[PDB]
């Protein structure tokens, strides 16, 4: 149905998902000069040492690495959050060129890609219940800039060949998500939504100030994925990002000065 093409892209989404024009839609532009430093903000607590990755799959929109979330194995706490949020999956959004790809922008600046680590609030029992709550999900957004290779990313880059087309999956166990984190945990935070349909407004966004760098060849391999299924006409998976949405009645808080 929906996609990122001229005929089914972001500009058409509202027809099937009216919330597209809601009050707390993501992503947004982070204007650094008007974001408010909040000293009551606690530091983030990322406990990914017991993370259990299971699979990687191309869902026709991006590739997602899924984790075992049956127990508190990889959780996010602290920051603007109240409660424990479990990591369920992470995916990327990237562009056809190095100067675009991220969904959130900083002072209108676009990065080559953006990593989203999706977590759901454990007080709600399961992910499905979490998506029915204003504080159900917490997504950690990390910008990727092209530069030196990211060692922790290569394992992911190496398996892309086997999940070239939509619907394909591959076992992807023992992957450590900690290799994808920048050195600093400083962040911006604001209430938002999922950036793809159903565009549910259940997300507390936490965007890290510090981006990680990846090589030209690493992001290049992202661009060789296919939106289409096997046997269908080939369509390269690129520019799977949604444009910035109006901030409206929201303010972006910064954990740093
Ligand atoms: C049945 O109810 C639902 C509710 C939500 C989904 C979306 N799936 S999802 O949570 O993995 C995400 C989609 C986009 C994400 S972004 N780019 O904002 O981080 S996270 C599926 C079924
Ligand atoms: Hg919600
Ligand atoms: Zn995303």
UniProtKB/Swiss-Prot annotation:
Origin superkingdom: Eukaryota
Cofactor dependence: Zn(2+); Co(2+)
Activity dependence on pH, as recorded: Optimum pH is 6-8.
Binding-site positions, substrate: 195-196
GO CC terms: apical part of cell; cytoplasm; cytosol; extracellular exosome; myelin sheath; plasma membrane
Modified residues (Phosphoserine): 162, 169
Active site: 61 (proton donor/acceptor)
Outcome, altering residue 59 to L: Reduced activity
Record carries keyword Hydrolase: no
Effect in UniProt of substituting residue 194 to A: Reduced CO(2) hydrase activity
Effect of residue 61 to A: Reduced CO(2) hydrase activity, rescued by 4-methylimidazole (4-MI). Reduced proton transfer. Enhanced proton transfer. Enhanced proton transfer capacity
Keyword terms of this UniProt record: Acetylation, Cell membrane, Cytoplasm, Disease variant, Lyase, Membrane, Metal-binding, Osteopetrosis, Phosphoprotein, Zinc
PANTHER family: CARBONIC ANHYDRASE, CARBONIC ANHYDRASE 2
Name by which UniProt lists this protein: Carbonic anhydrase 2
Record gene name: CA2
């Amino acid at each position: 149905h929906w996609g990122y093409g001229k005929h089914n892209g972001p500009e058409h989404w509202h027809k099937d998902f009216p919330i597209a024009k809601g009050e707390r839609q993501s992503p947004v532009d982070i204007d650094t000069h008007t974001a408010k430093y909040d000293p009551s903000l606690k530091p983030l607590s990322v406990s990914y040492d017991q993370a259990t990755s299971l699979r990687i799959l191309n869902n026709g929109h991006a590739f997602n690495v899924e984790f075992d979330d049956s127990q508190d194995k990889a959780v996010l706490k602290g920051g603007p959050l109240d409660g424990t949020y479990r990591l369920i999956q992470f995916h990327f959004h990237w562009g056809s060129l190095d100067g675009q790809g991220s969904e959130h922008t900083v002072d209108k600046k676009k990065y080559a890609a953006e990593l989203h680590l999706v977590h759901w609030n454990t007080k709600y029992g399961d992910f499905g219940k979490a998506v029915q709550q204003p504080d159900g999900l917490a997504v950690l957004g990390i910008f990727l800039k092209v530069g030196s290779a990211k060692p922790g990313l290569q394992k992911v880059v190496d398996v892309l060949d086997s999940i070239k087309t939509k619907g394909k999956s591959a076992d992807f166990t023992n992957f450590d998500p900690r290799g994808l984190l920048p050195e600093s945990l400083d962040y911006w935070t604001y209430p938002g939504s999922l950036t793809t349909p159903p565009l549910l407004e259940c997300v507390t966004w936490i965007v890290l100030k510090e981006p990680i760098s990846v090589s030209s060849e690493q992001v290049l391999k992202f661009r060789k994925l296919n939106f289409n299924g096997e046997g269908e006409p080939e369509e390269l998976m690129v520019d799977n990002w949604r444009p910035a949405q109006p901030l409206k009645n929201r303010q972006i808080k910064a954990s740093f000065k």
